[PDB]
């Protein structure tokens, strides 16, 4: 639970984006699932996260309008008690105590779930936990744990950004890379049982216990006191169970096990020389492993019965219990011994590429490891390792070697905190590195890592970091920040890379999310042949090195916003396409169907059970279930299962899977070689479905898309293109094309992040998250792909940049010369806040900046300016007192 102290309703142009809920980490990895980094996406914007905003339930960027007593957007002083259960598929919420009338169910149980709140800006929120971490205003539901009870052992609970590493830090950003997932021994048995029981009865006697089957503390009778020969049968079995476990683990530890006074109220135990004998540290570690196994079987038995610390594995178990178990289990060992028997690449923006001069920057290594630093041309690809291609010149200090189209030793190794500086003289075509302020010796007598290289495009600072690696970039905006500059750069006349630069360098890095890109002709194992009396798109791949490819058509078909013979053909809304699998391609690795724009899941293997699906069951004000809407980013059927028995060896023409989409009802149906499949799907209103097939390359010709039509069903192009909507002839306009999912994309870090004034303390009433800084950005939306990209990111996208520049030119032309009606029409598309942000923003492509300025001066400030300028020549003076004055 959590209270908002004061929520600004209209701090900015839009309402405050306040959502609370639970997010599931993807792939059981520390990387969480939800809004992408550096974007206006909160929780509930994908199948990974589930959110609630006071009036709507959010999942996959679509709201559900959940009803509740006094339904309204979250205002000040709202309890908002969220109850998460994962053994069952249900996540419920209660606004101010009254439960919401509808939960989420059948969400993908896998992955680690955590609470998460997207609080936009201009808000004040404060969580609640148990104990000193907060006050529980409302009582938890029966059989539920506290929020803080799930704290990791030996860890202090704290709150931080869910996925982004943004901290609003200048030239000190810890650009952390990928993380980690985060018969001969029967006498020995009897004698070991004897020794164990006598060791225990020594402690029993030290209290003053006697023997007897009854076990009463007042009578001090201990049945185990009697020797194993006369031990009672039940106590004998109890002792023998642990003796058997001990010797079984002794022989399973990888070492063969065979055969080779004190005050006594009862009898006199006679132990061997347990302490006298010396045991090697390897033996100690092996006995420790035995103790770990014993505690593991203990925990396995215990977990059946109460969230105790012992339930944690031995790795995170408390050291006190670990050591006690270790020594207790090692006592028997001593008795035996005595007897003798996704690497991330960051870089500066390509616009700051330098073709000449002397340049330097520093790279930090907080944790030594897979670190490479250097200069690469703009053509470098994120997937390829830095320095592994001719487009990149890198150096790895940990392995002490340079990388450019090959690996060659260079210099010595570095340690934690060893800054590496990059001397680059483009005029001299020299480039080398200074480790901790001293120049490396290369191999024999050289000092330069690379030389004699064509300038080509300007080289850009770049650094690649591997798993569990932390580094910092220092381009040299301020010389005082540079530490070892005065040792090397000052003497040799190398200027800092960004000393003259007025504003901080935008950083472009390899993005984790893979997006669908149009297939290129030069791409390996990717050849799409466009033939043509029905148009076909066949993929005859040749290299076939990659295992599984995901193919998607360029444009989708949208369903009706409200769900409900050539004549009936024209009235109908069903659209048909088909996929034909060429011989030699195994059908069981082919899945044919539809996807939305939210499918970014990538894996070496694809299964329909791994498809991200969550169904929200929205109920009534009376608690009665009425609607159960199921969401998914992938709707296909398996061609192998669709293959009719014997068609894998008897069908010479291959397998044809025809998909029919009825948009009026949101129904997806499949037909296999004229046989209707029992598998069908129902989609939500206003859903955009992309034709897509996933296939593993087993033959040169895998499969082909056919845009033909079946009787009484319109062709796919009719639903794709609005211009061709009534014509049933199949056509293939150039706009339609196949796109394969790829990881070769770059992402831009915003120069200004959303500063959060989180408490960062274990204060009472719960941790406080407050942010009163209004930050906004313009997002350009591609209607065809149903995706959004920041308008600042168009700098590296030349095609979108040019098209948008010409679109702004078209707006200016159509509203030019005082066309007031067109100006009013364009006022809706081009808004006043948009124009103000565009003109004010320092970071902006030049073409877009000029276009927005011209558009502003045309829609507004145009008619009056022109009329006044034209009138300026004339001079008419009224006969008034001011005129006389």
């Amino acid at each position, epitope marked *: 639970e959590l209270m908002v102290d004061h929520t600004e309703p209209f701090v900015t142009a839009e309402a405050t984006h306040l959502r609370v809920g639970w997010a599931s980490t993807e792939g059981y990895s520390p990387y969480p699932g939800g809004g992408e980094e550096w974007g206006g996406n909160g929780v509930g914007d994908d199948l990974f996260s589930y959110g609630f905003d006071g009036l709507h339930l959010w999942s996959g960027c679509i709201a559900r309008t959940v009803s509740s007593p006094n339904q309204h957007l979250l205002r000040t002083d709202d309890v908002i008690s969220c109850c998460l259960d994962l053994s069952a598929p249900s996540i419920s919420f209660r606004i101010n105590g009254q439960p919401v009338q509808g939960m989420f169910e059948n969400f993908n149980i896998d992955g680690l779930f955590f609470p998460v709140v997207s609080f936009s800006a201009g808000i004040k929120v404060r969580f609640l936990l148990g104990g000193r971490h907060g006050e529980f205003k409302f009582l938890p539901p029966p059989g539920y744990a506290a929020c803080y009870e799930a704290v990791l052992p030996k860890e202090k609970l704290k709150v931080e950004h869910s996925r982004e590493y943004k901290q609003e830090r200048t030239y000190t950003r810890d650009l952390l890379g990928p993380t980690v997932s985060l018969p001969h021994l029967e006498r020995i048995r009897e004698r070991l049982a004897e020794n164990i029981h006598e060791l225990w009865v020594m402690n029993k006697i030290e209290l003053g216990w006697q023997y007897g089957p009854v*076990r009463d503390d007042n009578k001090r009778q201990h049945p185990c006191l009697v020797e194993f020969c006369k031990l009672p049968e039940q106590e004998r079995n109890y002792n023998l169970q642990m003796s058997l476990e001990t010797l079984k683990t002794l022989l399973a530890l990888g070492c063969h096990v065979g055969i080779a006074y004190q005050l006594t109220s009862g009898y006199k135990p006679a132990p061997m020389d347990l302490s006298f004998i010396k045991l090697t540290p390897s033996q100690e570690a092996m006995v420790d492993k035995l103790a770990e196994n014993a505690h593991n079987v*203990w925990a396995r038995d215990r977990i059946r019965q109460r969230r105790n610390p012992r339930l944690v594995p031995y790795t995170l178990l408390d050291d006190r219990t670990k050591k006690s178990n270790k020594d207790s289990l090692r006592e028997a060992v001593r008795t035996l011994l005595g007897y003798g028997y996704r690497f991330r690449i960051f870089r500066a923006e390509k616009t700051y590429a330098v073709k000449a001069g002397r340049w330097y920057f520093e790279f930090e290594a907080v944790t030594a490891g897979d670190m490479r630093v250097g200069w690469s041309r703009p053509g470098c690809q994120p997937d390829l390792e830095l320095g592994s291609d001719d487009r990149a010149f890198a150096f790895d200090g940990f392995k002490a070697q340079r990388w450019h189209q090959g690996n060659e030793h260079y210099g010595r190794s570095w340690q934690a905190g060893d800054v590496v500086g990059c001397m680059v003289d483009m005029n001299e075509h020299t480039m080398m590195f200074t480790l901790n302020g001293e120049i490396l010796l290369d191999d024999s007598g050289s000092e330069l890592a690379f030389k004699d290289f064509d300038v080509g495009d300007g080289f850009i600072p770049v650094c690649s970091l591997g798993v569990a690696q932390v580094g910092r970039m220092n381009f040299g905006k301020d010389v005082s920040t540079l530490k070892y500059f005065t040792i090397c750069g000052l003497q040799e006349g190398y200027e800092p890379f960004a000393v003259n630069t007025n504003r901080d360098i935008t950083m472009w890095l390899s993005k984790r999310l893979p997006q669908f890109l149009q297939v290129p002709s030069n791409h390996e194992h990717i050849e799409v042949t466009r033939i043509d009396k029905v148009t076909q798109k066949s993929f005859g791949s040749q290299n076939n090195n990659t295992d599984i490819m995901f193919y998607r058509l360029s444009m989708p078909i949208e369903c009706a916003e409200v769900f409900s013979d050539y004549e009936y053909l024209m009235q109908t809304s069903t659209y048909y396409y088909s996929v034909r699998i060429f011989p030699g391609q195994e059908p069981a690795n082919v899945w044919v169907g539809w996807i939305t724009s939210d499918f970014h899941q990538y894996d070496t293997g694809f299964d329909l059970d791994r498809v991200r699906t969550v169904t929200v069951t929205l109920g009534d004000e009376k608690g009665k279930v009425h609607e159960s809407i199921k969401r998914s980013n992938c709707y296909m059927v398996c061609a192998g299962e669709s293959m009719s028995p014997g068609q894998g060896r008897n069908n010479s023409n291959g397998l044809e899977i025809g998909c029919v989409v009825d948009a009026a009802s949101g129904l997806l149906t499949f037909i296999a070689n004229g046989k209707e499949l029992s598998t069908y799907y129902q989609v939500e209103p206003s859903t955009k479905l992309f034709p897509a097939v996933f296939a593993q390359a087993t033959s040169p010709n895998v499969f082909q898309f056919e845009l033909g039509r079946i009787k009484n069903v319109m062709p796919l192009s009719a639903g794709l293109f609005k211009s061709e909507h009534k014509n049933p002839v199949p056509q293939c306009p150039p706009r339609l094309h196949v796109q394969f999912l790829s990881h070769v994309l770059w992402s831009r870090m915003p120069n200004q992040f959303l500063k959060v004034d989180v408490s960062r303390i274990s204060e009472r009433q719960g941790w406080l998250v407050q942010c009163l800084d209004p930050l906004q950005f313009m997002s350009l939306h591609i209607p065809e792909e149903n995706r959004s990209v920041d308008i600042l990111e168009l700098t590296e996208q030349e095609e979108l940049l040019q098209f948008h520049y010409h679109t702004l030119r078209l707006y200016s032309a159509v509203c030019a010369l005082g066309n007031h009606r067109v100006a009013h029409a364009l006022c809706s598309h081009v808004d006043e806040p948009q124009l103000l942000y565009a003109i004010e923003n320092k970071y902006m492509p030049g073409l877009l900046r000029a276009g927005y300025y011209d558009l502003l001066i045309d829609i507004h400030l145009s008619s009056y300016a022109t009329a006044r300028l034209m009138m300026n020549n004339e001079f008419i003076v009224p006969m008034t007192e001011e005129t006389k004055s």
Partner: nanobody
Framework: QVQLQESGGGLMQAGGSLRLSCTAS????????MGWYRQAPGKQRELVAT???????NYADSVKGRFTISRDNAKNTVYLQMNSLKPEDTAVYYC?????????????????????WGQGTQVTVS
């Protein structure tokens, strides 16, 4: 999973005879140390007389009265007879079967929590 079902503990006047039957059903391994735990409303939980295999009854401070507890290991069935009843004996009684033999554990923590706590019943005395 070893589940203990306890039936009995009706309500009558003091001095009456009360019969309680506890049956343990589950795994065939680790059957030992059946005990009764008494808890009064909002009061500390006490340990009632505990019987183990071999007719070994472990007594405590709460055994005052007329107790007759007998166990059979063939079906893991325990019969408890209360002859003398007192008003202070009104409490909930839980039947447990823990592998901790007779109430001692030389190993320690890896078995002190090795308890199969079954269902119980409320005994009321007028």
């Amino acid at each position: 999973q070893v589940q203990l079902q306890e039936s009995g503990g009706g309500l009558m006047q003091a001095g009456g005879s009360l019969r309680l039957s506890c049956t343990a059903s589950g795994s065939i391994f680790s059957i030992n140390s059946m005990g009764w735990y008494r808890q009064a409303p909002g009061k500390q939980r006490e340990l009632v007389a505990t019987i183990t295999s071999g007719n070994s009854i472990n007594y405590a401070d709460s055994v005052k009265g007329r107790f007759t507890i007998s166990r059979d290991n063939a079906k893991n069935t325990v019969y408890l007879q209360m002859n003398s009843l007192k008003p202070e004996d009104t409490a909930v009684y839980y039947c447990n079967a823990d592998r901790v033999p007779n109430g001692y554990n030389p190993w320690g923590t890896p078995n002190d929590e090795y308890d199969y706590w079954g269902q119980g019943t409320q005994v009321t005395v007028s």
